[PDB]
Amino acid sequence: STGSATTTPIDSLDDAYITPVQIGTPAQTLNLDFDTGSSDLWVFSSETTASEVDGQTIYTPSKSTTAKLLSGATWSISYGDGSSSSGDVYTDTVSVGGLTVTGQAVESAKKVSSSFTEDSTIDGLLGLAFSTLNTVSPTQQKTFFDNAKASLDSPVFTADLGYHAPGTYNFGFIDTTAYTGSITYTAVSTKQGFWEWTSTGYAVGSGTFKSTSIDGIADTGTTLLYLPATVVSAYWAQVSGAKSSSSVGGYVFPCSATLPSFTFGVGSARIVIPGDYIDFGPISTGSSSCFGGIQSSAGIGINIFGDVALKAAFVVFNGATTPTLGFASK
């Protein structure tokens, strides 16, 4: 089997991308944030504390003839930015772009933190990291991809995120028309439950390539590119007036600047992030200070190749027995 679904930025900054997902019978379509950095499929629901719902579409398991309570199962998750959600668990039929999994764990939120309440366009998350990170207790649950994997034509999914534009998640096949050149595959460590790999280095703008190993994760659920403070400083040093602001929470730069590109290495290949992809616009409406799309990972503990990086590439998440990641230019 295969599936293919369009993913759409939630706003003009590409802060996150949402993909329609059919849950239950008859289908209840929710727009979920596909997150290769986590492993829970959770949704706003009829059980979510009413004061914490602000315009999201909710899943109502009582209206699904295929929903079953996963008796005694609870979940609770906290994300890298401090946001969180928790609740109980149903199993139900979940379909993405024509690909159907029966008995998928659908984690129904009883509580969500403020950032989720404020994102009226995100109805939940669909985790695509390794199932070892799934938070359901006492019986850990598999991701949608893990459940679908054996049925797929090939045990892969691909992320083709757009720049200020829709993109595509495909399951079970590689769309050879969606990228230029060849896909360079690179080894993955699953030891932390992530799509964790080692970039071979970087370049800033037209500069030469700096060969250096950068261990990080391919995370569609993170907006920005988080890299070691050394690399990030070398990038922003090329932008007149750019500096790290403690009050703002990262590097800012004059909105009057044109940004240099940033290249990252995948083996001997190179992915070039255009400078415009690193511009996240005014820190507040009307400000002439703009927020940078490349930020330091120093306080995070791990480097994160988030959407800023991934949207410059066609990315293959190869879930074969030995997982790998593929990157192609596009």
The catalytic residue positions are 35, 199
For residue 10, give the 3-state DSSP assignment: coil
Nearer to ligand IKN, 83 or 289 (CB): 83
Among 20, 24, 155, 221, which residue sits at the site for ligand IKN (rule: CB under 6 A)?
221
Site size for ligand IKN, by CB under 6 A?
20
- Are 221 and 33 a contacting pair, CB within 8 Å? yes
Q: Cα-flanking dihedrals φ and ψ of residue 280, to 5°?
A: -105, 15
Residue 232 DSSP label: H
Q: What's the closest the beta carbon of residue 268 comes to ligand IKN, in angstroms?
A: 27
d(CA 4, CA 99): 8
Nearer to ligand IKN, 277 or 305 (CB): 305
d(CA 269, CA 260): 19
112 lies in the site for ligand IKN, by CB under 6 A: no
Stretch of 162-170, 174-182, 183-191, 218-226 contacting ligand IKN, by CB under 6 A: 218-226
Residue matched to tokens 């080692």 = 198
Nearer to ligand IKN, 125 or 214 (CB): 125
Strands (E), 97-195: 99-112, 124-127, 156-160, 167-171, 184-187
Stretch of 118-126, 207-215, 250-258, 269-277 contacting ligand IKN, by CB under 6 A: 118-126
Residue matched to tokens 């590109």 = 261
Nearer to ligand IKN, 35 or 146 (CB): 35
Nearer to ligand IKN, 122 or 316 (CB): 122
Q: For residue 269, which of 219, 203, 324, 217 has the smallest C-alpha distance?
A: 203
For residue 37, the Cα-to-chain-centroid distance in whole angstroms is 6
d(CA 284, CA 169): 31
d(CA 124, CA 108): 9
C-alpha distances in Å from residue 205, one per residue of 232, 265, 275, 278, 308: 13, 14, 8, 12, 15
Enumerate residues 76-105 that contact ligand IKN by CB under 6 A.
79-81, 83
For residue 81, the Cα-to-chain-centroid distance in whole angstroms is 13
Q: What's the closest the beta carbon of residue 194 comes to ligand IKN, in angstroms?
A: 6
Q: What's the closest the beta carbon of residue 125 comes to ligand IKN, in angstroms?
A: 6
d(CA 56, CA 40): 18
Nearer to ligand IKN, 40 or 92 (CB): 40
Give 243's strand partners. Answer: 252
Enumerate residues 5-64 that contact ligand IKN by CB under 6 A.
16, 33, 35, 37-38
107 lies in the site for ligand IKN, by CB under 6 A: no
Q: What's the closest the beta carbon of residue 302 comes to ligand IKN, in angstroms?
A: 6
Among 26, 138, 286, 301, which residue sits at the site for ligand IKN (rule: CB under 6 A)?
301
222 lies in the site for ligand IKN, by CB under 6 A: yes
- Are 115 and 83 a contacting pair, CB within 8 Å? yes
Q: What's the closest the beta carbon of residue 11 comes to ligand IKN, in angstroms?
A: 12
* Sites of contact with ligand IKN (CB under 6 A): 16, 33, 35, 37-38, 79-81, 83, 115-116, 119, 122, 125, 219, 221-222, 300-302
